[PDB]
Design an enzyme around this catalytic site. Structure first.
Site, short mmCIF file in Angstrom:
data_model
loop_
_atom_site.label_atom_id
_atom_site.label_comp_id
_atom_site.label_asym_id
_atom_site.label_seq_id
_atom_site.Cartn_x
_atom_site.Cartn_y
_atom_site.Cartn_z
N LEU A 9 0.67 -1.36 0.04
CA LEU A 9 -0.10 -0.58 0.04
C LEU A 9 0.96 1.18 -0.21
CD1 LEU A 9 -2.85 -1.01 0.21
CD2 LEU A 9 -3.10 -1.03 2.56
N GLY A 10 2.40 0.66 0.62
CA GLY A 10 3.15 2.30 0.43
C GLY A 10 4.94 1.69 0.67
N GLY A 15 10.55 1.31 5.79
CA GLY A 15 10.35 -0.05 4.92
C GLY A 15 8.82 0.96 4.02
N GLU A 16 8.24 -0.65 4.25
CA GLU A 16 6.76 -0.51 3.27
C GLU A 16 5.58 -0.67 4.73
OE1 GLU A 16 5.93 -4.22 0.93
OE2 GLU A 16 8.90 -3.89 0.97
N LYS A 32 2.63 -1.84 9.00
CA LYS A 32 3.82 -1.94 9.10
C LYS A 32 5.10 -2.12 9.25
CE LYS A 32 5.50 3.30 10.25
NZ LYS A 32 5.55 4.22 10.76
N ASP A 118 3.94 15.99 13.52
CA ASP A 118 3.98 16.19 12.60
C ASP A 118 2.51 16.10 11.16
OD1 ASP A 118 6.14 13.92 9.68
OD2 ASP A 118 6.03 16.14 9.73
#
Ligand SMILES: CN(CCO)c1ncnc2oc(-c3ccccc3)c(-c3ccccc3)c12
Length: 257
Positions: A9-10, A15-16, A32, A118
């Site tokens: 998904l990203g 990492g990813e 994650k 953030d």
């Protein structure tokens, strides 16, 4: 309970994120994936305190040798960032709704003494009912404990969203800084554009804003009611800046749309 990894998904630093679906129950989650070759133990420790409908649900962790695993609610609506058409933004009624929710999420975190640090369209995810969910607690820290505020001094975040006091001050309060970033977000949403690269006296656009030159972009694209709210939020002096209780009293905020 073998989540198998349907699709990326990203990507990122860490990492990813994979769309891990179960195959028995078919329950989707975002996962994650973080190569530890911190931070991770703080983000988990924080994710463990959170329970709110506008904060991204934390499910579990799994150490698994070298790679940490965070099982987080899946947001099939994607990022708020992709609902912002460049140079345009979105309809004012959609923006107001996303601001409402964003404020409910932030109130909630501040209430439990946590600052996100953030806030940006990229870290605001949307579920399939398009409900806003605050995501990613890697820069997040405690600013209140035992009912006792600690000031911050680590500079961090993303420059176009960061408040002026954190470029200019040894130490500063956590809450105004999220308040400012929320207003940069609102701007993005109503204008399709970020006003400055950074809030520093050496940035033309920012000096133009302080000089109330709102016949320039982004501000001319923004209707007067939301713009008067942005005037109260993007106050350089964090003590003069509007608080969330007062944001909730503001005219645009309470305008039916
Ligand atoms: C990004 N994180 C982890 C933070 O909770 C997510 N968490 C929980 N649900 C999610 O759904 C997504 C997502 C949704 C639709 C398309 C693509 C991704 C993403 C997504 C977003 C951008 C990049 C990587 C992943 C996501």
């Amino acid at each position: 309970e073998d989540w198998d990894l349907v699709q990326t998904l990203g990507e990122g630093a860490y990492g990813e994120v994979q769309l891990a679906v179960n195959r028995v129950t078919e329950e989707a989650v975002a996962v994650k994936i973080v190569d530890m070759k911190e931070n991770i133990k703080k983000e988990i420790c924080i994710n463990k305190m959170l329970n709110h409908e506008n904060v991204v649900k934390f499910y579990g962790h799994r150490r698994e040798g070298n790679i940490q695993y965070l099982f987080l609610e899946y947001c099939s609506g994607g990022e708020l960032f992709d609902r912002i058409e460049p140079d345009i933004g979105m309809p004012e009624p959609d923006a107001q709704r996303f601001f409402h929710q964003l404020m409910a999420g932030v109130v909630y975190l501040h209430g439990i003494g946590i600052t996100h640090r953030d806030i940006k369209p990229e870290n605001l995810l949307l579920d399939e009912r398009d409900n806003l969910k605050i995501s990613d607690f890697g820069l997040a820290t405690v600013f209140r404990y035992n009912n006792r505020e600690r000031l911050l001094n680590k500079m961090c975040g993303t420059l176009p969203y960061v408040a002026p006091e954190l470029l200019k001050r040894r130490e500063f309060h956590a809450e105004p800084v999220d308040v400012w970033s929320c207003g940069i977000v609102l701007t993005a949403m109503l204008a399709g554009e970020l006003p400055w690269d950074q809030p520093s006296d050496s940035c033309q656009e920012y000096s133009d804003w302080k000089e109330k030159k709102t016949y320039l972009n982004p501000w001319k694209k923004i209707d007067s009611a939301p713009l008067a709210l942005l005037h109260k939020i993007l106050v350089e002096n964090p003590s003069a800046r509007i608080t969330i209780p007062d944001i909730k009293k503001d005219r645009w905020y309470n305008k039916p749309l």
